[PDB]
Symmetry: C2
Subunit: 85 residues, 2 copies
């Protein structure tokens, strides 16, 4: 089960600097991370992550949202978009 | 702590018919629900809900995403948008 999140609420350089620590952690978990833009939103798909890793990455996303004063949203399990990329 | 979610992936009438069951449950929990459109996305803010109620509403959102083949996203705790409406 992948996890999909979006970063928003700042310019792309700033969203990328927020994202980079989560990307690093995902990478070390053995995950595959897919990035793309949707307007001013940064879309992040993370695959190859089991339940516990998704929980940990969600905690990291929360820390980053707080750290940088941005908004992070996460696709809820069962969503059409999760299995139709 | 409020919870913010977005419904997307269908026309507004269909997103509203998906949303209506979650709205009803939120209402009965004693919540205050705020609705607005952002393009084709339905934005839903739910306030006056404690931790356990948010968990239950998140489970309902998952059931609705599955039921209707739509996408539901949720704002992660700590996000700027949660305390800056």
């Amino acid at each position: 089960m992948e996890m999909d999140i979006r970063f928003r609420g700042d310019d792309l350089e700033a969203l990328l600097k927020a994202a980079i620590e989560m990307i690093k952690q995902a990478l070390k978990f053995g995950a595959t991370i897919t990035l793309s833009l949707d307007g001013n939103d940064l879309e992040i798909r993370i695959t190859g992550v089991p339940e516990q890793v998704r929980k940990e990455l969600a905690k990291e996303a929360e820390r980053l949202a707080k750290e940088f004063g941005i908004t992070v949203t996460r696709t809820i399990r069962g969503s059409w978009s999760l299995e139709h990329h």
